[PDB]
Amino acid sequence: GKITLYEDRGFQGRHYECSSDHTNLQPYLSRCNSASVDSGCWMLYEQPNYSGLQYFLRRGDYADHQQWMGLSDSVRSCRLIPHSGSHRIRLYEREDYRGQMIEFTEDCSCLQDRFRFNEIHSLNVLEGSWVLYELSNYRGRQYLLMPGDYRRYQDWGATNARVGSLRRVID
């Protein structure tokens, strides 16, 4: 994977190229107003140490930070999302994998059409990397998920349990 991040809009100003996970882009970038994903799928983070608001970027060119649904020009860490050939995830009604539960091996643009809960309070990612979305049709806050346990919604970086859609990360 290869991504180039630019301080100014329209792919101008000081830029920085990444091909691996960076937990602190601040020494190389005081702001990010455009990005070019040559290869791979990337998650940009508003704050260092993979924290703050998250934004999923696939291959392509983004002339403004709004083009990746960003609400500011703050990009202080990034992750090259691991590719995976199979995807399976379990969402749970309550914390610690309790309550009603539903499994997905495909994308779902409308979770509420299949689950009858506006909130997910725990989940287990068995295979593949996913992007979790606060709202349906892949809108609202985005939360990168990777194989592993998520016993409470704070574990995927969320301040509320709202989930509306989820998408597999494929190259």
Backbone as a ProteinNet text record, in pm:
[ID]
protein_1_A
[PRIMARY]
GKITLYEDRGFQGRHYECSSDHTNLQPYLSRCNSASVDSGCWMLYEQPNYSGLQYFLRRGDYADHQQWMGLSDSVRSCRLIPHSGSHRIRLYEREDYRGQMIEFTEDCSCLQDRFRFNEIHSLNVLEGSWVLYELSNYRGRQYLLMPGDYRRYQDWGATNARVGSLRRVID
[TERTIARY]
80	0	83.6	34.4	105.3	5	25.1	-59.5	29.9	-11.8	57.1	-40.4	-1.8	-87.2	-28.4	-113.5	-71.4	-129.1	-51.1	-94.9	-203.5	-204.2	-299.8	-393.8	-504.7	-602.6	-546	-608	-566.1	-426.1	-379.2	-251.7	-134	-130.1	-25.5	31.5	136.4	203.1	293.6	349.6	433.8	353.9	414.6	348.7	434.2	371.7	439.4	380	467	427.6	440.3	338.3	337.2	316.6	381.2	358.5	343.3	336.1	317	242.7	204.6	127.9	212.4	158.6	221.7	131.9	184.4	109.3	126.1	214.6	239.7	294	203.4	240.1	272.5	263.8	285.8	424.8	534.5	665.2	677	588.1	595.2	480.5	383.2	259.6	193	175.8	103.8	-45.9	-89.7	-229.8	-238.6	-360.8	-383.6	-512.4	-500.7	-615.9	-637.4	-550.6	-571	-485.9	-529.5	-463.2	-475.2	-372.4	-370.1	-332.3	-426.8	-404.4	-362.1	-231.8	-183.8	-227.7	-221.6	-255.5	-293.2	-367.5	-411.6	-531.9	-585.4	-693.6	-642.3	-676.7	-619.3	-728.4	-695.8	-777.1	-695.9	-747.6	-685.2	-748.7	-668.1	-712.5	-689.6	-787.8	-779.6	-668.5	-642.2	-544.1	-431.8	-317	-210.9	-253.3	-176.7	-199	-333.8	-371.7	-489.3	-614.5	-634.7	-746	-814.9	-929.8	-1011.1	-1100.3	-1151.1	-1236.4	-1157.1	-1222.1	-1160.3	-1225.8	-1145.2	-1193.9	-1130	-1214	-1169.2	-1144.6	-1028.2	-990.2	-949.5	-1014.1	-974.3	-888.3	-844.9	-760.8	-832.6	-760.9	-816.8	-749	-802.7	-750.7	-858.9	-821	-913	-859.9	-921.5	-873	-902.1	-1001.7	-1033.5	-1053.9	-1040.2	-1064	-1210.7	-1301.2	-1442.2	-1464.2	-1377.9	-1391.5	-1376	-1310.6	-1308.7	-1396.8	-1497.4	-1593.2	-1527.4	-1405.3	-1338.8	-1404.1	-1409.7	-1468.5	-1364.3	-1236.6	-1128.3	-1007.4	-900.2	-775.6	-675	-721.7	-634.3	-622.7	-504.8	-471.2	-336.3	-336.8	-217	-172.8	-245.2	-199.3	-279.8	-220.3	-283.4	-244.6	-329.9	-312.4	-335.7	-244.2	-267.2	-345.8	-469.7	-562.1	-524.2	-509.6	-468.8	-574.5	-529.3	-616.5	-657.8	-774.9	-824.5	-914.3	-903.3	-982.3	-1118.8	-1144.3	-1273.6	-1309.6	-1439.5	-1489	-1603.1	-1596.7	-1703.4	-1699.2	-1815	-1826.3	-1957.4	-1957	-2075.8	-2101.7	-2220.4	-2263.3	-2361.4	-2349.5	-2427.8	-2510.9	-2628.2	-2719.3	-2660.1	-2595.8	-2543.6	-2393.8	-2334.4	-2191.5	-2154.9	-2025.7	-1969.5	-2035.9	-2072.2	-2124.3	-2252.6	-2339.7	-2466	-2583	-2700.1	-2819.3	-2835.4	-2922.8	-2940.5	-2811.5	-2793	-2667.9	-2696.1	-2617	-2630.9	-2492	-2473.5	-2345.4	-2353.1	-2242.7	-2233.5	-2107.6	-2122.5	-2009.1	-2008.3	-2104.7	-2112.5	-2124.7	-2118	-2151.3	-2299.5	-2333.4	-2472.9	-2488.9	-2558	-2580.8	-2692.9	-2769.8	-2879.4	-2889.5	-2817.7	-2820.2	-2959.8	-3031.7	-3162.1	-3266	-3241.5	-3328.1	-3309.9	-3214.6	-3187.4	-3171.6	-3176.3	-3140.4	-3237	-3301.1	-3398.1	-3331	-3210.7	-3143.9	-3064.2	-3083.3	-3003.6	-2863.3	-2836.4	-2708.5	-2649.1	-2517.4	-2440.2	-2344.2	-2348.8	-2270.4	-2153.3	-2143.5	-2025.2	-2023.9	-1904.3	-1891.2	-1762	-1759.9	-1641.3	-1611.2	-1491.7	-1447.1	-1367.7	-1426.7	-1361.5	-1262.4	-1299.7	-1208.2	-1229	-1119.7	-1124.6	-1128.3	-1095.3	-1104.7	-1232.6	-1298.9	-1424.5	-1417.2	-1503	-1531.7	-1674.7	-1690.7	-1821.4	-1868.1	-1997	-2052.6	-2165	-2162.6	-2264.9	-2404.1	-2416.8	-2545.3	-2552.5	-2674.9	-2696.3	-2641.3	-2623.1	-2564.9	-2427.3	-2350.5	-2209.8	-2192.9	-2267.7	-2260.5	-2230.7	-2199.3	-2166.8	-2024.7	-1999.8	-1866.9	-1829.9	-1703.4	-1651.7	-1554.8	-1561.1	-1476.2	-1411.7	-1279.3	-1207.6	-1210.7	-1242.2	-1239.5	-1141.2	-1078.6	-982.9	-1008	-960.1	-983	-944.2	-1032.9	-1015.7	-1147.3	-1145.3	-1265.4	-1289.4	-1417.4	-1460	-1578.2	-1547.8	-1650.2	-1735.7	-1694.6	-1773.5	-1744.4	-1840.2	-1832.3	-1713.7	-1667.4	-1546.9	-1424.7	-1428.7	-1312.4	-1286.1	-1388.5	-1365	-1362.3	-1330.8	-1308.8	-1433.2	-1548.4	-1674.5	-1712.8	-1780.1	-1838.6	-1987.3	-2045.7	-2182.1	-2190.8	-2296.5	-2312.2	-2381.9	-2410.3	-2485	-2408	-2472.9	-2419.5	-2532.8	-2505	-2607.5	-2572.7	-2443.6	-2398.9	-2255.4	-2211.2	-2076	-2032.5	-1905.4	-1850.7	-1719.2	-1701.9	-1574.7	-1469.3	-1345.2	-1232.5	-1170.5	-1183.5	-1124.2	-1042.5	-936.5	-850.7	-901.5
-121.1	0	126.5	229.9	356.7	470.9	567.6	685.8	808.7	916.2	1044.4	1148.2	1216.4	1314	1453.2	1549.3	1685.1	1782.6	1885.9	1983.4	2075.7	2101.5	2192.9	2117.7	2183.2	2123.9	2111.7	2024	2005.7	1950.9	1872.2	1800.7	1897.4	1996	2097.3	2110.4	2191.6	2211.2	2094.8	2102.2	1994.2	1864.6	1755.9	1626.5	1523	1409.6	1299.4	1168.3	1073.1	944.4	836.7	752	641.9	509.8	405.4	268.5	173.7	226.8	146.8	231.6	168.3	237.7	345.1	466.6	578.8	621.5	615.1	656.8	804.9	874.9	1016.5	1080.4	1137.9	1207.2	1354.3	1402.2	1544.2	1594.1	1519.9	1571.1	1587.8	1527.3	1534.7	1613	1656.3	1712.3	1795.5	1925.1	2011.8	2015.3	1957.7	1952.6	1861.3	1820.6	1737.1	1781.5	1833.4	1880.7	1805.7	1710.8	1625.9	1500.9	1393.3	1264.5	1188.4	1109.5	1025	883.9	791	651.4	579	553.6	477.4	331.9	273.2	132.7	108	-0.2	-37.8	42.1	0.6	70.6	125.9	251.2	323.7	379.2	388.4	457.3	574.9	695.8	815.5	848.8	903.9	935	1082.5	1144.6	1287.2	1318.4	1228.2	1247.3	1145.1	1169.6	1068.3	946.4	838.6	713.1	650.9	662.7	595.1	625.7	754.2	800.2	917.4	955.4	1059.3	1004.8	1096.9	1058.2	977.9	877.2	787.8	803.9	790	801.9	694.8	617.7	510.4	565.3	533.5	578.1	457.1	439.3	339.4	406.1	326.5	378	488.7	597	711.4	838.8	951.1	1083.3	1164.9	1233.3	1311.5	1454.3	1543.7	1681	1765.9	1729	1799.8	1696.7	1740.8	1647.8	1607.7	1689.6	1652.2	1532.8	1515.1	1401.9	1267.8	1264.7	1145.4	1161.4	1248.8	1276.9	1338.4	1389.4	1452.1	1584.3	1611.6	1734.5	1839.2	1810.4	1904.1	1859.8	1938.6	1905.6	1839	1780.7	1716.8	1568.8	1527.8	1387.4	1364.4	1294.8	1280.3	1135.9	1039.3	901.1	827.3	720.7	644.2	497.6	411.8	267.4	210.8	125.6	46.8	-77.4	-85.9	-188.3	-322.8	-427.7	-558.2	-616.1	-664.4	-734.5	-869.3	-916.9	-1046.3	-1105.1	-1236.5	-1306	-1351.8	-1351.8	-1390.7	-1296.1	-1275.2	-1179.8	-1242	-1229.5	-1275.9	-1195.2	-1143.3	-1058.4	-1090.9	-1078.2	-1098.8	-972.6	-915	-800.4	-846.2	-788.9	-831.8	-716.7	-751.5	-650.7	-580.7	-656.1	-602.6	-628.9	-571.7	-584.9	-729.5	-759.7	-890.5	-1003.5	-974.8	-1075.5	-1140	-1059.3	-1107.4	-1039.5	-1100.8	-1052.4	-1113.3	-1051.1	-1093.1	-1071.1	-1151.3	-1150.9	-1181.5	-1120.8	-1139.5	-1142.8	-1230.7	-1249	-1199.1	-1142.9	-1093.1	-1146.7	-1194	-1222.1	-1132.4	-1041.5	-944.9	-805.1	-705.5	-569.9	-560.8	-458.8	-432.1	-281.5	-220	-76.1	-35.1	-130.3	-97.8	-211.1	-195	-295.7	-310.4	-198.9	-202.4	-277.9	-298.8	-385.4	-532.6	-567.7	-707	-735.8	-635.1	-661.6	-604.7	-491.5	-427.9	-370.4	-316.2	-240.1	-129.4	-5.9	104.6	107.6	27.3	28.6	-111.4	-118.8	-240.7	-215	-300.9	-279.6	-375.6	-477.9	-562.6	-633.8	-674	-746.2	-826.1	-931.9	-1014.4	-1021.2	-977.9	-986.1	-1115.4	-1213.8	-1343.6	-1347.4	-1293.6	-1284.6	-1153.6	-1098.7	-982.5	-851.8	-744.5	-609.8	-544.5	-470.2	-404.5	-257.6	-178.5	-42.4	-40.6	-4.4	9.4	153.9	172.5	305.1	335.6	457.6	499.7	494.7	538.6	549.7	453.5	429.5	341.8	404.6	319.7	358.5	422.7	374	410.7	560.9	613.5	753.8	765.6	887.7	912.3	870.3	857.2	821	680.6	663.4	535.9	478.1	346.6	276.8	158.4	162.1	49.5	-68.5	-186.4	-309.6	-406.8	-487.4	-588.4	-713.5	-829.2	-953.3	-939.4	-986.2	-971.3	-945.3	-943.7	-921.3	-772.4	-735.8	-599.4	-613.1	-626.8	-656.1	-535.4	-414.5	-295.1	-192.7	-101.8	-13.2	82	113.1	193.9	125.4	-7.2	-79.3	-49	-10.7	33.6	185.4	254.9	398.2	483.6	428.2	500.3	555.8	670.7	729.3	699.4	631.5	581.8	451.4	375.2	242	242.2	359.5	367.2	302.3	208	144.8	134.7	171.4	169.8	86	66.2	-11.2	-55.9	-152.4	-205.1	-260	-238.8	-270.8	-345.4	-452.7	-523.2	-439.6	-453	-385.8	-483	-452.7	-534.5	-444.4	-501.2	-428.9	-444.6
0	0	0	-68.1	-78.2	-78.5	10.7	19.5	27.9	-38.5	-32.9	20.3	127.4	193.6	176.8	141.5	110	211.6	244.4	343.8	289.5	159.3	98.7	5.5	-28	-117.5	-258.6	-337.2	-474.9	-490.4	-393.2	-402.6	-415.3	-326	-324.8	-184.1	-172.4	-45.4	-9.8	110.8	160.1	167.5	121	117.9	189.7	220.2	287.2	238.2	206.2	151	257.9	268.9	364.1	291.4	343.7	299.5	417.8	539.7	659.6	761.9	872.6	975.2	1042.4	1047.8	1116.2	1231	1353	1470.4	1501.9	1430.7	1458.8	1330.2	1251.5	1128.6	1151.1	1275	1301.6	1262.9	1282.8	1238	1087.3	1008.7	863.5	801.7	881.6	827.6	935.9	910.6	1002.8	975.3	863.8	823.8	702.4	669.1	551.8	484.5	362.3	287.2	156.7	122.7	6.2	22.4	-42.6	-30.1	-161.1	-191.3	-310.3	-267.4	-280.2	-244.7	-372.1	-385.3	-500	-491.3	-372.1	-355	-209.7	-188.3	-55.9	-9.9	104.4	171.5	303.8	332	444.1	534.1	662.4	761.3	813.8	795.4	849.7	984.2	1074.5	1209.5	1238.7	1304.6	1333.9	1433.3	1526.9	1632.4	1619.2	1682.1	1682.5	1762.9	1745.4	1817.4	1781.3	1654	1599.1	1681	1708.9	1790.3	1721.7	1776.3	1716.9	1607	1525.4	1413.8	1311.4	1253.7	1157.1	1020.7	915.6	778.7	691.9	623.5	536	396.1	339.8	206.4	124	9.4	-88.1	-195.1	-292.7	-399.9	-476.3	-501.7	-570.4	-524.5	-571.8	-539.9	-471	-363.5	-281.5	-276.4	-353.9	-365.6	-242.7	-163.2	-40.4	68.9	194.1	303.2	311.6	257.1	251.3	159.2	58.4	-32.7	38.1	154.3	238	361.6	353.5	460.6	583.6	569.6	682.5	719.1	849.1	900.4	936.4	913.7	940.2	858.9	866.4	798.6	891.9	1001.8	1099.4	1065.5	1019.3	997.8	1064.4	1178	1259.3	1277.9	1222	1217.6	1111.8	1058.5	952.1	964.5	909	913.2	774.1	728.3	607.8	647.4	601.3	650.2	589.3	670.2	616.5	523.6	408.3	315.4	373.6	331.8	376.3	268.5	248.7	149.1	194.4	324.9	379.1	492.6	511.5	609.6	688.4	820.8	908.2	1036.9	1077.2	1194.9	1265.1	1397.6	1479.5	1560.1	1544.2	1623.1	1730.1	1849.6	1964.5	2019.3	2072.8	2126.1	2247.9	2336.6	2461.4	2472.2	2576.5	2599.9	2632.4	2617.3	2652	2573.6	2448.4	2355.6	2407.6	2467.4	2521.4	2451.3	2464.6	2398.2	2260.2	2181.5	2043.2	1964.9	1860.5	1786.5	1640.1	1552	1408	1345.7	1247.6	1180.8	1037.4	989.1	852.7	786.4	662.8	576.1	453.3	441.7	333.4	392.2	304.5	344.2	379.6	458	491.9	505.7	409.7	411.7	506.1	559.2	650.8	753.1	864.4	969.8	1029.1	1044.7	1110	1028.3	899	820.2	853.6	940.9	973.2	1122	1209.4	1348.4	1452	1421.9	1511.9	1636.9	1620.2	1725	1658.2	1704	1652.6	1711.3	1813.9	1883	1887.1	1870.4	1891	2006	2107.8	2228.5	2243.8	2159.5	2154.7	2020.5	1978.1	1852.5	1853.4	1773	1754.3	1605.6	1567.1	1428.6	1414	1346.4	1335.5	1219.6	1103.4	990.3	916.2	864.6	778.6	855.7	784.9	838.6	788	876.1	843.4	881.5	818.1	861.1	912.7	1039.4	1101.8	1088.8	1061.5	1037.2	1135.1	1189.1	1284.3	1222	1096.9	1029.5	911.5	864.9	750.8	623	521.6	393.1	409.6	507.3	524.4	546.8	643	680.1	829	871	1009.6	1043.2	1173.3	1220.6	1174.4	1137.7	1090.8	1192.8	1211.4	1307.1	1236.8	1223.8	1166	1262.2	1209.7	1286.5	1223.2	1307.5	1265.6	1348.8	1302.4	1377.9	1524.5	1611.9	1754.9	1825.2	1958	2036.8	2058.4	2067.2	2100.3	2196.3	2325.3	2425.1	2461.2	2423.6	2450.2	2341.6	2320.6	2204.6	2213.2	2334.3	2348.5	2288.7	2272.1	2221.1	2074.1	1997.7	1861	1849.2	1958.5	1954.2	1951.9	1988.2	1981.5	2118.1	2116.4	2236.2	2248.7	2150.2	2159.4	2081.3	2108.2	2051.4	1915.9	1859.7	1734.8	1620.4	1552.5	1432.3	1331.2	1206.4	1103.9	982.5	957.8	842.9	867.2	786.8	798.3	663.4	630.6	499.5	515.7	438.7	436.4	365	410	346.8	247.1	118.2	13.3	-78.2	-134.8	-227.9	-370.6
[MASK]
+++++++++++++++++++++++++++++++++++++++++++++++++++++++++++++++++++++++++++++++++++++++++++++++++++++++++++++++++++++++++++++++++++++++++++++++++++++++++++++++++++++++++++

